[PDB]
Amino acid sequence: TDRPDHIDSRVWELSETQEDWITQVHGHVRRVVECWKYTICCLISNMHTHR
Amino acid sequence: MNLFTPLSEINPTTTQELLYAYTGPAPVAYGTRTRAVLENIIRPYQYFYKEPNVQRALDIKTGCKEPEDINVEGPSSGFHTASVLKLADNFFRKYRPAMEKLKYWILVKLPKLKYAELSKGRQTYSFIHKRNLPAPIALEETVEFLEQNLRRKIGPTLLSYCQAIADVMELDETTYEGARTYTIKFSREELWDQMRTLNTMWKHLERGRLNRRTIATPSMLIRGFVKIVEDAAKEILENVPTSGVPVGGEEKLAKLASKQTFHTAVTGELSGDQEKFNECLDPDAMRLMWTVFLRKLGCPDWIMELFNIPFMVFKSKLADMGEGLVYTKGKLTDRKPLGEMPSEFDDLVRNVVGNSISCRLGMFMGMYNLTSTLLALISIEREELTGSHVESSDDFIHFFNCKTHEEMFKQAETLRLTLKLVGINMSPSKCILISPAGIGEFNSKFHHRDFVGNVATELPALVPNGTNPMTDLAMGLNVIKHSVNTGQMNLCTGALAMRIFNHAYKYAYMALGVTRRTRFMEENAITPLLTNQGASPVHSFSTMHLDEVALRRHLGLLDEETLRRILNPNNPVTQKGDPSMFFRIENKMPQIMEDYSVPSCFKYTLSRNRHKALLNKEERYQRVTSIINKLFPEVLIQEASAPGTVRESLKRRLELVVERSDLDEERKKRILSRIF
Amino acid sequence: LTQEVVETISGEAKLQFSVGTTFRTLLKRDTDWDVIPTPRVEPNVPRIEGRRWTQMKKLPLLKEKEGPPSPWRALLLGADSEYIVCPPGTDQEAISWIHSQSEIECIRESKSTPASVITCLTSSLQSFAEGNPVRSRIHEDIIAFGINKKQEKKQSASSSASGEWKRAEYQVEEMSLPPWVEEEMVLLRSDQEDNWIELEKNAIYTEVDGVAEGLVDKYIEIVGRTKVASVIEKWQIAATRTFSQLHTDRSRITACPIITRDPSGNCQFWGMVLLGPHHVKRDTDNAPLLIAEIMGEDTEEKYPKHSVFSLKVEEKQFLLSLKITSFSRNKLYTFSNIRRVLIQPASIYSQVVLSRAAENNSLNLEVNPEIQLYLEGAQRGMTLYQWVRMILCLEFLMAIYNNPQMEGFLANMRRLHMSRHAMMERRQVFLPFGSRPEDKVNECIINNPIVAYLAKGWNSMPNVYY
Amino acid sequence: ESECTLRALVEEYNGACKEAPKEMSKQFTDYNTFKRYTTSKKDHAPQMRLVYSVRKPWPISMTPSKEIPLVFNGTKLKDTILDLGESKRTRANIVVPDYWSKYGSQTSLEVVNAILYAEDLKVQRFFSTEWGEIRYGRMLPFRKPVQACPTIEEVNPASIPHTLLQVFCPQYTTLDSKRKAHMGAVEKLKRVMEPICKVQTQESAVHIARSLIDSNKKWLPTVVDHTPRTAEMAHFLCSKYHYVHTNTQDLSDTRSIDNLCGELVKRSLKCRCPKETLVANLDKITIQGRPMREVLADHDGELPYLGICRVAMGLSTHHTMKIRSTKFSILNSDHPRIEVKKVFSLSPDVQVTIPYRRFKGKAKVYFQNDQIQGYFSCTDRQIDEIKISAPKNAPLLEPLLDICYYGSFIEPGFEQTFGFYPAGKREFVDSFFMHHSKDHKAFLIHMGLDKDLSLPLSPELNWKEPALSKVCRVTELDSTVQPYTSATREFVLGETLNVYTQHENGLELLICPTEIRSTRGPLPPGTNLSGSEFIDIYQDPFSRAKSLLKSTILHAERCKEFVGNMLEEYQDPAETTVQSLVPINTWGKSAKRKLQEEITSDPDWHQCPRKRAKMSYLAIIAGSIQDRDKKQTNVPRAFMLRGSQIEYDMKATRGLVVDTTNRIIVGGETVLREGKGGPEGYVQTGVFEEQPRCYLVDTPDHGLSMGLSRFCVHSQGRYFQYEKKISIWEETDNIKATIDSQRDLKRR
RNA sequence: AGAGAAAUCAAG
RNA sequence: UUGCU
RNA sequence: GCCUGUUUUUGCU
RNA sequence: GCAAAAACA
Ligand SMILES: *O[C]1[C]([C]OP([O])(=O)OP([O])(=O)OP([O])(=O)O[C][C]2O[C](N3=[C]N([C])C4=C3N=C([N])[N]C4=O)[C]([O])[C]2[O])O[C](N2[C]=NC3=C2N=[C]N=C3[N])[C]1O[C]
Structure with a gap:
């Protein structure tokens, strides 16, 4: 549907009810950018353990 | 009529096809449209009050009236504000998936709408030339006007176009400077008048009505604004059960059949039209309904403003009067404006602005078929109405499943009153209710046990076009095939239509009797071998979809000796005037440009007998598009996204393709030497 | 989407749409609300006292106009x-033989068509005898084709103009159902020697x-040997021959x-059609025509504008x-494809044959059932073949009289047809308060003879219906 | 040669720059708008001019040429005298095409074959279907969307633009476009259009290619269980008064995909949270070279398991509730079909439960079976009305009993027990059907009898059969009734892989596992279950071992996990595979000891593929089925797989694994090629408008084969420089791990 | 003349 | 120049 | 002269 | 996307 191909389905589903995208400027683009940031956060924390 | 009413074998419904005088001439309009335009202007003012009082109803702006003001024994122009609010609330509370789809369209589909979609239209009034021009021409001139007045570049999105339209109205003065050379100027008031101006004209070749009607068209300055509202209305209507306008063909019939459930003790069916439609609807009611829809969805203020622009503009509509009411002294027929001498439209003289007349009430035009459908549907949603309703624009069908007859009568009266609460009046003479359901009509589709086929709705298309014999044959066969598949014509009717079309097609191409073509073929021993050449037909009832040449080759009626001649890609008959580009699958050079001809020699073109400078500009656009397509094959499958200007992009692509030509170095340098 | 992405990253966040100050004032001129309406009324649907739906116990009676036939x-x-039988050959040879x-x-x-224009026809015959379908003008052509008639009528009106300017107030004369419609129905159905429908058979696989x-x-064999087919062929041939000569400007x-x-x-x-000086600018404007054609029987009350001549040949x-x-270009083009009426x-x-086949699960192809119809106010049986025959007759009659x-x-x-079909199945029909379905039909019954016949x-x- | 094409392009570019100084200073993306300006191609009405146009003295307009003689025998052909040289200037008679049909230059036969290929397909397809016998039955139409023409391949719409780009312009594509394309369709289209593109222009060739691989469904009225699954011959095989009984097999891979999906669903339900397990596996399984998500998007079938897997991937489904031979569809209802958890305990302590479903409120359900179709309206559990359309004298036992089972209207078998305690749901339902087959009096006592003879249903359930009394509230269908949905349904995949449809007042069950009945079928060709956690699906020991070895060799982390779980008797997702690959032996402890020496001596073993192969071999032997009686012996150098003559070797010198210094081949396929084509893929790593300092490969293919660490591709004036992937994990795995950690931290 | 039907054509 | 049953 | 909306059938880019 | 044709409101 509206999900970009690079955005994971789980990330897209989780981002639906995080911010009220309808009132924001470029709500779809803002949601895509937030998904980008969350995916970057996921890639930073990837199978790394300390204790 | 007695010959059309069988009583033993077939029912009268199957004879509804006999109540069609088609294949005879269609009525046309002859003279001045001013009388019809003025009637359309004056009708909304005559229906606002129970008693006709045009003068008192001319100074009102918003057509909101009290419940006791609404006329129940005749047309009622106007709406009840509280009723509209409550009904829109009820319609939003129900059909939540439709509102979710609306939200998705606003978030996703709306920002990517392109103003080039406005080019899909037809003859459009031009605020520059004061004339009807083709939609691409008007779109280009409006875009250039905006470009040179705002001193900026409009984005491809329709939102950018609407923002440019909003911005250009802020300027005190504007200039076009077409330079076909000629310079024209506009003020804020002049541009305001031109944007809210509807050019009117006669509608010709329309069947099914005694009196000629007038059509209208606005400029490109408001078509873009209406486009967003129409798209949103379509998005809502595609997801509501009670809509009938966005679905067509067999899908509409399936939707109708899904609601033909009659199980209760009393099962009635009411099929009808709405009288005086498109002139009893106040655009303020549409504003209120859209505002409620976008406010319960949480949309911001700019969405509301954008959705409200078109209806506010049409509240100030200046319908273009014709060329003057006709007056007679003796046998003379002179033509005078509205205000010169008294007539039946004197009360509207105060509304005359130049050659146009203002109309606050009504909508005068069919630019909101989808929005008017939504306005009709919101009134349906209430606890009293429990039947199934289908509404396209002004044709509606309703199914009542009630325990008792009086309950059905109360439901029908409630339906009529709710439609009147918004500004939609049932046509009493055109509304028929059958208390045992099963027989009905919708969009000229009649049903008794199943939707019967309607012959004579397919005969106007059973005429060869003027492209070429092969295209004409394919179009005729496929039209008959779709008619058969739809069920309009059966086996015998399909075959008879095929034979009639074949005979007309052969006559149209000089393939019957003794003609110049037949004499030339006979004197040179040229056997026909093709349908357009007078040979026996190869298409059968079951071979509607099959191409003539391939079928004749398969059956052996067309030998390879003539096949290698008629299908020559180098025949002079259909040779294109310009070299064309060709792909090469798994080749060192995937791009080969050479002269080409249409394969079939019978796919020729017919010579024609022998916004002016804009046509030359569009020819330049054609040249640029052709070179882009030749140099950028990938945009042939996907949208254009190359960065930079056209010149630099094609220069880089040309350098790249020459670099990959596998030629030696010197060839490459002397080729890139001559690139400008 | 690069511009939007960069805008969201930077954060300027332009609202994508904004209405200015003076544009808002322009918009709010013809409405009582702002750009975003906020009425101060409580949302509520009131109760309105409505009328009562009335049953249509009997079908409406369409009124019959009164006047001259x-x-x-x-x-x-x-x-x-x-038609006149002529030795085989080309059209020029046949016309030379006749003339x-x-x-x-x-x-x-008749006063409408002066007899003196007959010479025109003969002149045309002469012109078409030596293979010249276009001939120079003669004097009588001015009477025949109304050359410069508009200017003369304008001058006469200006000379006779008197009084004060008033509105148009056009009038359409109402005429009654003529007796010749029933005769046309009874005729046009008699058998003919030839098939008159020779369509190439499609392939069979x-x-x-x-x-x-x-x-x-x-x-084809049940409606072919019928006067309808011959008249349809004549109409199609005449329409095509006259249409093919109208895509140009001629003063001859x-x-x-x-x-x-x-x-x-x-x-x-069957006759000849003379096309006078025509300079067509549109597809709906009229062009003058002079229609000579062979009658079978002359009626004063049926052809008041026709000047009947006696022709002696062999x-x-x-x-x-x-x-x-x-006559117009569009009408001629429409009648060029009149064969579609079949x-x-x-x-x-x-439909009848296939319904019977589906009922019996087998095709018969020779069924001629007994359709029950109201013939003379009473329900009688009638064979399917002649039912189809005069259905074709009436369809052709309506096609050539479509206005x-x-x-x-x-x-x-x-x-009304649907209402009648509903009531014959014991279904009740109910109508709104001011419902008069017959008025919308009666307003269209003015002077068309076949509308009056229907x-x-x-x-x-x-x-x-009981 | 190619030089003339370059000259033509350069001259055209120069002319465009000179003749149009404007219209090219605009942005390139503006082509999306000004391509739509195609006026001057408009004519008033060509149908009203054809008769006159053909009969003009010189009707045909054509470019000047010398092949057509100026004057042929007697007649003059071309009007080449007036203004010869103005492009499409020459005027010729209508007979010139007739003159060219004979006495003309010919063309090679392969050109003629290529031109007519698309139409010849239709011609032979028509003259290949067996024409049955016409049956006349007064058909009641069912309006549904059907595919217009058959396709050589089934490709989801989103992959259509990328597939065509892979066929015509590989040189202007990126690796993402390559991965999103259907490579089987790409190869088929390339083979088909290799001759076609020589006689068709670029846009024409694209048109035929898309028409070959696009669906283009259109709404038509068809006949129930007689749809020709294509509108190509709909006008011939059905005309509302007849059908032609035609025979045609499925000729598709949809059933194999259903078998794969059913195996995945059945094996997924045996673990914790089956939904996440199935979603994770479907994102790692591939068929041929296409990922499972895209092949699911390709095949939008009517089957249950296919629908479950499509819903699991966020797609829709067309499955409808079906009880044996009768299909049901809820037209409208007040509340969803409520489940009842009725318990039929066999003992105070031992209990057996058979949940069922019913209606709460008023509902209306359309049903159809064979040629019988109609609807029934009910309230709660009492049937209110039944409308049926069926052929005369047809037996209506099975449709009515299916209706009763669907609504639980009849209760010798609902809310109570038949008799002896039921063994389970299967036996209970079978007993219900077999009892009510010979006892239909429950229907009669449910809706009584009527003294009116006009009712068509006979007491012994025959349509329009004369009798003494008739069944009440069952009448002939008045008007056509068909299920239609306006709003696009969105499906919810709940636990136990239950596919629900979102109803207004709750959730409407659509597909429910544990009662879907289907025998095991062949897997789709090219299925690659080497992803994770599911290898026992393969019946062949060969492929079953090959997938496991591909998983272990190509992934160091997977090899480490496999060795760790296989040495200390931990839970291994592929225990059954290892048990079924190695016969009963006594080499377990010896192999475990060998694992001990080779993990202690070289703890860094899990980077050399040879070491990974040796460790995997030893681990697979270690956890085999150890014989109870015989004493442990030394591990053999090579052994034999169960039920096959396939030899598995330690040193991989012969048999299933062969590891030469140049390359490693597993199961006849080169899993590793040393030097070029590393095991891990590539990442895009940069988009530029200017040539990067790398190697510009011609296409995405001819890339990924040289094994370069830096290569660029071109796409619409932009450059994409793929370099290498160095991260051992994957973005999907990273996202899954992050979300799992977040949810666990929320729960804990 | 005439075609025609709410007003036009009947050329410059 | 002119040929549809 | 020949509006808007929906659907359908062709052909061309 | 464009051009033509048709039907419906
Ligand atoms: O509107 C239209 C659209 C619709 O369709 P669909 O189905 O969707 O498909 P597609 O096409 O893919 O879509 P899109 O994406 O939007 O588009 C794409 C691109 O590319 C192009 N093209 C295409 N195609 C097919 C083609 C082209 N070009 C040429 N020349 N040819 C061809 O063929 C386009 O333009 C774009 O840009 O879509 C489209 N389409 C369709 N069809 C067509 C088109 N276009 C053109 N043509 C055709 N034929 C349209 O829009 C745009």
């Missing part, structure tokens, strides 16, 4: 059309194709003979119509 207002004669062996004598002259072509052949006289050919090859002269007597008319009676026939009145009448008669047919059948 309608004349035959059509391009060609119809059932009175006849050199013909005597013309005026027997009935499958059994579905076989049954389809069998049904088509049955329909063009002859468009109406000639068909039998299987034996002998020519059949010890044979014929009648000639020779009417002055103005589909609807074929639709009825095929706004006919379009409106047929469009508004469908509701109205009489509707009135004849019962209106109350």
